[PDB]
Amino acid sequence: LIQSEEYVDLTFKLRGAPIPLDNGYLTYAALSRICPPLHELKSIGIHPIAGIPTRNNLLELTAQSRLKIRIYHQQIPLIYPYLAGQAFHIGQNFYQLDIPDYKPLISSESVYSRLVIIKGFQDSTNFIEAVQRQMDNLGIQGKIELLTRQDGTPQRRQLTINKEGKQFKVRGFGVKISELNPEDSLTLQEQGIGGKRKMMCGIFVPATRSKEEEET
Amino acid sequence: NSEEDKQYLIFIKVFQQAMKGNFAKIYAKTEEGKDPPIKKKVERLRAELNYCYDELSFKEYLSDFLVRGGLNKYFNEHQEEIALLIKKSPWQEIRIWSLLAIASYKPKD
Amino acid sequence: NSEEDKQYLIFIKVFQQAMKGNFAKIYAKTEEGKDPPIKKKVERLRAELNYCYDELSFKEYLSDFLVRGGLNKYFNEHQEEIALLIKKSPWQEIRIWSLLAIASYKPKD
Amino acid sequence: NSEEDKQYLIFIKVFQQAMKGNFAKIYAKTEEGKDPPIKKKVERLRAELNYCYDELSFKEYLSDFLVRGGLNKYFNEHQEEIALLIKKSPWQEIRIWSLLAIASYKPKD
Amino acid sequence: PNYYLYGTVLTRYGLASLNHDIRRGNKTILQKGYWNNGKIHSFVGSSAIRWALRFYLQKQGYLVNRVWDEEEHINRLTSEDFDPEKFYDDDIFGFALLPNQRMGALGMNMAVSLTPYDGAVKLGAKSGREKDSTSLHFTEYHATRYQYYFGIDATHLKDFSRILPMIDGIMNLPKVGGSSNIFNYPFCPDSLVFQWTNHFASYISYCFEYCDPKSKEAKLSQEFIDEVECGQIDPSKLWIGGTIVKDLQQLDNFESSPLNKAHIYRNRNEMIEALKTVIKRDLGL
Amino acid sequence: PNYYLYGTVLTRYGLASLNHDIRRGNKTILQKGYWNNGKIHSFVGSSAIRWALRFYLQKQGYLVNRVWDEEEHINRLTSEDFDPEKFYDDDIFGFALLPNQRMGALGMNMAVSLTPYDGAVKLGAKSGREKDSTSLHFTEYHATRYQYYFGIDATHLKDFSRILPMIDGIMNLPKVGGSSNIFNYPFCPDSLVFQWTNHFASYISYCFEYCDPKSKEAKLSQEFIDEVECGQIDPSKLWIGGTIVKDLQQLDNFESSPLNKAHIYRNRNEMIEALKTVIKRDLGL
Amino acid sequence: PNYYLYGTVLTRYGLASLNHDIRRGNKTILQKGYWNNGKIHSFVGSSAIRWALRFYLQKQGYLVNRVWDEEEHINRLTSEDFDPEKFYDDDIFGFALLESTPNQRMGALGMNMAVSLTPYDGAVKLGAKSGREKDSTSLHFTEYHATRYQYYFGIDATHLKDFSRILPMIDGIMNLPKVGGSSNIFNYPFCPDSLVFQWTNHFASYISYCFEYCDPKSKEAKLSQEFIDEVECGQIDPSKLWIGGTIVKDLQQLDNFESSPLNKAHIYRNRNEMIEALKTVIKRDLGL
């Protein structure tokens, strides 16, 4: 019920050809090529693109599909002229961004992260204690829950970094976090957890997306 | 039978529900003893639908219209196929279906 | 009798109600001592109807005319039947039906 | 007289009134000269009726001509009967009736 | 003869929030769109500038049909019938009620920000009655200079002497937008490029441009300099004054360039006085 | 000999709302349609340009039949019987009464926006309170440079000397369109491609094209340059001038290119003077 | 021998409202009908192009029985009896004197209606008589169409009374005057921009409509794959094929163009050079 200050969500309407469901390095590299200053930013995150799933491991862009960026509201003039109204290419297709809209950061008792990556922690228990430690660093208190598939197993995801000729394997979990209170909820939403924040993973969102991800 | 018309019909129904939600929102917008127009709302909707010039126009328009329609139950049970019908088919055909839905909307209220 | 004949007759009624609405709108538009149109608006409607090609343009114009007619009960009771009849059927046949409705709308006014 | 005979006579009267309206329109448009032609109009109507080759084209022409006629009081009084007769009957028989109405026409004195 | 006064005026640098778009949600978004180089620029409607000029005419004491109350925020008409012969407002801006209508000598275009919109936003807490609640809402601000293009048909004026108050009002423009202008943004000119000619053609529409996307100084577009150098724009009909004159005089080969023989003054008031003298001589005032 | 003057005219960059579609509702729909590469482009009707040319002929004192009142906003005919020998407008634009017909020596095509039309709707509220039909309104505007193609059959003129005022009017074209109060868009050419030849074949229609779908920069289409280089379009009959001259001259191998042999003048006035000298020599004026 | 000159010419891109239909109401509609894929294309009648060719023949001197007044918009016949030996128009376009030397002639020119390369979707232009007063003749609409036009023609050269009259006909096809239409507001030059001519001595043509579009709402024009397959398979002797215009660049940009049989055809980017070469061949073959 508390709208966070100093942090906003820059949302660009996204249109173009269908894209892989694991954009990650693809979208990040495209934006970095379009926006050189995006590489050197620190406290910025790119939202997972919202669109229905299509065949293979691709993702189809709808009219509601939009590129959303979480950024310090004073750092917008560093990337706005490079992104607002410009176009970026994923693979061989051209994608166009229009004038973005600002969305405030709302507090929620239960928050969700579709993907959380911590280096060197692959099992569930070590990952859980690592996220507890990360909460301890930021001084946030809450109960950690892991998103599960239809079989109840904790859900894992993989990030493919196509750096140079070799392709890289970075993997993590998707967690659901509640019992946060609005202040710590906003703190976790801005700060995020884990690494690879610009890599379309590690940021947070309300638990409605948690249930939606649980559905499929 | 020949489920294309089934998709056409529940598209009409979801359009009618979304427009009803929008008329309710307009009812919320107005205040004091001025009579909230009803026919003028339909005229305004028709004029805005005719304002578009293909593809991006009327597609983001009608998507926004459905979104502002509010809690649409049949839309909830018919998210995916309605979205697929929106993405496919010529936009002028979608406009024709929307206009027919407007012309057949009233007996709800 | 026969479902197709009943649908055709009540579609004629729908079109006649639509022309009543459009003619009332034209009546409201004109003012002062100028004589409001009666026959020349019918000629205009005829000219606009014959100005039609392929399936898309005629259906667009028909839907726009039906919406501009405003309130109508015959389309109110029968949503699925007229929606399917307009969406299906050759557009030339629907133009013939619309002209037949035009030639017999006048007993109302 | 049977009901079929009554509808046939009403259709003949409808077509005659439509020809009255069309010929009055021609008279108004061609007031210049000694007198607008009358036999030439009948020959034109016969040629245009004989031009029709299939049901769709003939019925399109018939509806267009009937609407161009004007009020057509006999069509005012008989929406459903005449509309069903036009929609149902084979186009050749309707052409025969229309040409009989042409032959049995009395220009206004 | 037919005489026309074309001019592009450049405003002073500062924070600007004028003529906002639809205030949907909590945010107050600036009026922005595409401009040269395919970059987003903030716009200011020309209707607001025309209203500001009319308000200047009213405040200075000139007889105007439409009068601003300034307290009830209601526009009142001195006379129901429009008389351009007697009213400055009807003579200058025209009228239309729907001679029941008049075109009006003044013709303007929207003010366009010099630099592309950087996307800067400001956080503000608006008042609320829900137990003294404060809701954070977004207001867009642009730190830039605006330039707009206007055209005057002096002959079309019922009274030829009414052009001088128009120039004075353009120079001393009141506050634009009024309540919507959150930060008080002076719209008075900082650099002027005027043209007093007798031809319909004008090539001084938008002659200003930025050296760098983030700068507080302005430069004349190379297209305008080329147009002056080739001979398309007659230097005797060209009037340049303001801060841009200081930058122009530092350019190399300025004395040899055809831009030198144009009427160029560092002080805006001196250029305005000289142009008004020329106009009075030509219009027989 | 039958002499024809073909030409494509490119206008300056600015915010334009000149020709609107059927007006009803909130939006004033810009006259737009499909164009090359299948994108929506805003259009300006050729009838408006012809009206502007006739108005220019009227304002310069040339004898014309139709006279624009400028006060009643109606068209008055000096003579009920058209006489192309005496009246400039009847000779140039023709007439139809319904000899009572004339094809006219001027043939002009519709003006096409160089840049596709994307967005840019304007807010049209009227002060405060009394939210009547004059309340919240939308106006469409386009930030682009328009381009149109015209063709004059010089021999068809009753008086051969009347072609020169037509060229002058094309140069100094008066107000085109309607929204001049808020969208002042000068229609004077800034780039010209003229062809004075004795053939019915013209290959210069709509020769300009954009370099960036959202930029003000303009460039002659590669098709036109290929047409000039292949051997078609005799360079001696080609007249190119305006701001496109700089871009043409910055091209590589320009000196060796056949385009160099065309009459290329950076100053439009110099091109017009030379072309008028050639026309007077050819038509025996 | 019996020599025939077949050809398909493609016009330039531009707003075109050349050929209209019955007056109808306040809206002047184009002559349109279904052409391909069930889509509606706009047509320009071949009588319009024949009238334009007659006007070209009249303007460039020559002897034509029909003389267009161009002032009273009337047609005058210099001789009431048609003489194909003397007059160019009677020799080329034929005549038919039905009211009651032969009174009828089949003419040496056979044309087909010009078909718009792009389907006609919308494109109605609002037209107003302006002023403040309104009347019945105030608000009118005119249909236009931004497309290229493409028509097919064939000449029976041996049928000409004078064999040398083919050359002025080719010149007129090149420098065609305005094709009947609203040139006041929609000036559409009908001069060719791409040519596919065939100068053969047999009746088969196979080059009727060789131009087809890509991205149906674009000005780009390409040679139909059916025509290319016809050329490559062995039919349509390349030595008898004359291709000229802006399609030459696209043809030369094709892969394996040198190895393709299409490379052996007479391909000239400049239309004047192609016309000169074709006329040289025609004069050699016809003994002129």
UniProtKB/TrEMBL annotation, chain A:
It comes from the Bacteria. This is Type I-MYXAN CRISPR-associated protein Cas6/Cmx6. It comes from Nostoc sp. 'Peltigera membranacea cyanobiont' 210A. The gene is cas6.
From TrEMBL, chains B, C, D:
It comes from the Bacteria. This is Type I-MYXAN CRISPR-associated Cas8a1/Cmx1.
TrEMBL record, chains E, F:
It comes from Nostoc sp. 'Peltigera membranacea cyanobiont' 210A. It comes from the Bacteria. This is CRISPR-associated protein.
Automatic annotation (TrEMBL), chain G:
The lineage of its organism: Bacteria, Bacillati, Cyanobacteriota, Cyanophyceae, Nostocales. This is CRISPR-associated protein. It comes from Nostoc sp. 'Peltigera membranacea cyanobiont' 210A.
